[PDB]
Ligand SMILES: CNc1ccc(-c2ccc(/C=C/c3nc4ccc(OC[C@@H](O)CF)cc4s3)nc2)cn1
Ligand SMILES: CNc1ccc(-c2ccc(/C=C/c3nc4ccc(OC[C@@H](O)CF)cc4s3)nc2)cn1
Ligand SMILES: CNc1ccc(-c2ccc(/C=C/c3nc4ccc(OC[C@@H](O)CF)cc4s3)nc2)cn1
Ligand SMILES: CNc1ccc(-c2ccc(/C=C/c3nc4ccc(OC[C@@H](O)CF)cc4s3)nc2)cn1
Ligand SMILES: CNc1ccc(-c2ccc(/C=C/c3nc4ccc(OC[C@@H](O)CF)cc4s3)nc2)cn1
Ligand SMILES: CNc1ccc(-c2ccc(/C=C/c3nc4ccc(OC[C@@H](O)CF)cc4s3)nc2)cn1
Ligand SMILES: CNc1ccc(-c2ccc(/C=C/c3nc4ccc(OC[C@@H](O)CF)cc4s3)nc2)cn1
Ligand SMILES: CNc1ccc(-c2ccc(/C=C/c3nc4ccc(OC[C@@H](O)CF)cc4s3)nc2)cn1
Ligand SMILES: CNc1ccc(-c2ccc(/C=C/c3nc4ccc(OC[C@@H](O)CF)cc4s3)nc2)cn1
Ligand SMILES: CNc1ccc(-c2ccc(/C=C/c3nc4ccc(OC[C@@H](O)CF)cc4s3)nc2)cn1
Ligand SMILES: CNc1ccc(-c2ccc(/C=C/c3nc4ccc(OC[C@@H](O)CF)cc4s3)nc2)cn1
């Protein structure tokens with residue numbers, strides 16, 4: 156294997172633009188999960204027999 | 218293997234722009250999780266048989 | 280293996296821009312977790328059989 | 342292995358810009374965790390069978 | 404292994420800019436943890452079977 | 466191993482800029498931990514089976 | 528005018544890759560100009576009533 | 590005018606890669622100019638009524 | 652004008668990589684100019700009514 | 714004008730890498746100029762009505 | 776004008792790497808100029824009506 | 838004007854690395870100038886109507 160004058164991207168996020176002008180929110184969470192932001196996960200490898208990689212709003216409850 | 222004048226990106230986040238002008242929030246969390254920010258996780262490797270890498274708003278409760 | 284005049288990025292975050300003009304928040308957390316900031320995790324390796332690497336808003340409770 | 346005139350970044354954060362003009366907050370935390378700052382974790386390796394590396398807003402309670 | 408005229412960064416944070424003009428906060432923490440600053444952790448290695456490296460807002464209570 | 470005219474950074478923080486103009490805070494902590502400063506931890510190695518390296522806002526209480 | 532989290536390129540050259548394997552040249556210039564290299568000019572502004580900006584192989588002779 | 594978390598490039602050259610393996614040259618210049626290298630000019634402004642900015646192989650002779 | 656957490660490049664050269672393996676040259680210049688190296692000029696401003704900024708292989712002869 | 718946590722580069726050269734393995738040259742200059750090295754000029758300002766800033770291989774002869 | 780936690784570079788050269796392994800030269804200059812080294816000029820300002828700043832291989836002869 | 842926790846570089850050279858392993862030269866200069874070393878000029882200001890600042894290989898002869 157060899158790379159000459161090249162590039163690679165094995166899991167990336169970019170150019171995430173967010174313009175929020177004159178907003179209003181009123182969240183009233185009482186249990187559980189409310190996720191109203193801007194998230195950006197970027198992984199290369201997640202092994203493991205049960206891994207819950209990259210969760211956003213998870214309520215895993217017995 | 219060899220790289221000459223090259224580049225690599227094995228898990229990255231960049232160019233995350235956030236313009237919030239004249240906003241208003243009223244969150245009233247009472248239990249659980251409220252995540253209204255700007256998050257950016259960037260990992261290369263997560264092993265392990267049960268790992269919960271990159272959680273955002275998790276409520277894992279018995 | 281060899282790298283000549285090259286570059287590598289195995290887990291990175293950059294160019295995180297945040298412009299918040301004329302905002303207002305009113306969070307009233309009473310238990311749990313409220314995360315309304317700007318976070319940036321950047322890891323290379325997380326081993327271990329149960330690791331919870333990169334949590335943001337976690338409530339792991341029995 | 343050898344590197345000539347090259348660079349490496351195995352877990353880094355940079356160029357974190359935060360412009361907050363004319364804001365107002367009113368957090369009233371009563372138990373749990375409120376994290377409304379700007380955080381930047383950057384690790385290379387986290388071993389261990391249960392490690393909770395890079396937590397931000399954690400409430401791990403029985 | 405050898406490096407000639409090169410560079411390495413195994414866990415670093417830099418270029419953390421924070422401009423806060425005309426702000427106001429009113430935090431009223433009564434138990435738990437409120438973290439509204441600017442934090443920057445940068446580690447190379449964290450071993451140990453249970454280590455909680457890089458916590459910010461932790462409430463680990465039985 | 467050998468390094469000629471090179472550089473290394475195994476856990477560092479730099480270029481932490483903080484401009485706070487015309488602010489006001491009113492923290493009223495009554496128990497727990499409030500951390501609204503600017504922190505910068507930078508370690509190379511943390512061993513030990515339970516180490517809690519780099520805590521900021523910790524309330525570890527039974 | 529203002530730019531937020533943006534970029535500009537007013538005259539640039541990049542990603543010039545040149546792979547020359549097992550070549551042979553025999554140039555026998557006797558007057559004039561022979562230019563068999565790799566050139567990359569990049570200017571922003573060239574004023575002047577007669578300017579000959581960015582010449583490569585010029586023989587301007589009376 | 591103002592720039593926040595942005596970038597500019599008003600005349601630049603970068604990522605010039607040149608791989609020359611097993612070559613042979615025989616230049617026999619006898620007058621004039623032979624330019625078989627790798628050149629990279631990068632200017633911002635060249636004024637003047639007759640300027641010959643960025644010449645490579647010039648023979649300007651009366 | 653003002654720049655916050657930004658960058659500028661008004662005339663620059665970078666990332667000039669040159670790999671020359673198993674070459675051979677035989678230049679026999681007898682008058683004039685032979686330029687078979689690697690050059691990198693980088694200027695910001697060149698005034699003057701006749702300036703010959705950034706010449707490489709010039710033979711300006713009456 | 715003001716710059717906060719920013720950077721500027723008004724004429725610079727960097728990251729000039731040159732790998733020459735198993736070469737051979739035979740230059741036989743007899744008058745004029747032979748320039749087969751690695752040059753890097755970097756100026757900010759060159760005034761003057763006739764300045765010949767940044768010459769490399771010049772033969773200016775009447 | 777003012778700069779806070781910032782940087783400037785008004786004419787600089789850096790990261791000039793040169794790896795020459797198993798070479799051989801045979802220069803036989805007989806008049807003129809042969810420049811086969813590694814040069815790095817870095818100026819801020821050159822005034823004067825005729826200045827020849829940053830010459831390398833000059834033969835200016837009547 | 839004022840600078841707080843900042844830096845400036847108005848004409849500098851640094852990080853000039855030169856690795857020459859198993860070389861051989863045979864220069865036989867007979868008049869003129871042969872410059873096969875490693876030079877690094879770094880000036881801030883050169884006035885004067887005719888100054889020849891930063892010459893390397895000059896033969897200025899009538
Ligand atoms: C050919 N026959 C076979 C073949 C395969 C199998 C087989 C394969 C995989 C598994 C995995 C079982 C798991 N159990 C848990 C419990 C909890 C948890 O995470 C808890 C939480 O707190 C963390 F987020 C993650 C996991 S994965 N079981 C059986 C059986 N028989
Ligand atoms: C062929 N037959 C087979 C094959 C495979 C299996 C098999 C494979 C994997 C597993 C994994 C079991 C786990 N249990 C927990 C509990 C808690 C936890 O994390 C707790 C929390 O506090 C941390 F976030 C993480 C984990 S992973 N079990 C059985 C069985 N049989
Ligand atoms: C083929 N058969 C097999 C194969 C595999 C398995 C198997 C594999 C993995 C596991 C892992 C069990 C764990 N338990 C805990 C408890 C607490 C915790 O963290 C507590 C918190 O305070 C820290 F955040 C983390 C962990 S991981 N168990 C069984 C069984 N059988
Ligand atoms: C094939 N069969 C197998 C295979 C694997 C296993 C197996 C593997 C891993 C584990 C890990 C168990 C842990 N328990 C704790 C408790 C507390 C804690 O941290 C407490 C807090 O204060 C610090 F943050 C961290 C940890 S990790 N258990 C069983 C069993 N069977
Ligand atoms: C194949 N079978 C197997 C395989 C593996 C295991 C196995 C592996 C790891 C563990 C770890 C157990 C721990 N317990 C604590 C308690 C408190 C603490 O920190 C307290 C706080 O004050 C500091 F922050 C940290 C730790 S880690 N246990 C069992 C069992 N069986
Ligand atoms: C294969 N079977 C196995 C394998 C592994 C294990 C195993 C591994 C690790 C551990 C660690 C147990 C610890 N307990 C404490 C208590 C307090 C503390 O710090 C108190 C505070 O004041 C300081 F901050 C730190 C620690 S770490 N236990 C069991 C068991 N079985
Ligand atoms: C409405 N009527 C008008 C309007 C416009 C004009 C008009 C406009 C431009 C010009 C330019 C004339 C020039 N002459 C030279 C000579 C040599 C040289 O460079 C020499 C070499 O060594 C450098 F590389 C560059 C230049 S530009 N002339 C007349 C006349 N009438
Ligand atoms: C409306 N009527 C007008 C309008 C415009 C004009 C007009 C405009 C420009 C010019 C320029 C004339 C020049 N002459 C030289 C000679 C030599 C040289 O450089 C010599 C070499 O050694 C350096 F490299 C550069 C220059 S530029 N002339 C006339 C006339 N009439
Ligand atoms: C409206 N009418 C107008 C308008 C404009 C003009 C006009 C404008 C510019 C010029 C420039 C004339 C020059 N002559 C030389 C000679 C030698 C040299 O450099 C010598 C070498 O050794 C250094 F490298 C550089 C220069 S520039 N001339 C006339 C005339 N009429
Ligand atoms: C509107 N009419 C106008 C307008 C403009 C002009 C005009 C403008 C510029 C010039 C410049 C003339 C020069 N002559 C030399 C000679 C030698 C030298 O350098 C010698 C060497 O040794 C150093 F490297 C540099 C220079 S620049 N001349 C006339 C005339 N008329
Ligand atoms: C509007 N009309 C105008 C406008 C402008 C002009 C005008 C402008 C500039 C000049 C410059 C003339 C020079 N001559 C030399 C000689 C030798 C030297 O350096 C010698 C060497 O040893 C050092 F390296 C440098 C210089 S610069 N001349 C005329 C005429 N008329």
Ligand SMILES: CNc1ccc(-c2ccc(/C=C/c3nc4ccc(OC[C@@H](O)CF)cc4s3)nc2)cn1
Nearest residue numbers: 761762763823824825826885886887888889890897
């Ligand atoms: C509007 N009309 C105008 C406007 C401008 C001019 C004008 C401007 C500049 C000049 C400069 C003339 C020079 N001559 C020498 C001689 C030798 C030397 O250095 C010798 C060596 O040993 C040191 F290295 C340096 C210099 S600079 N001349 C005329 C004429 N007319």
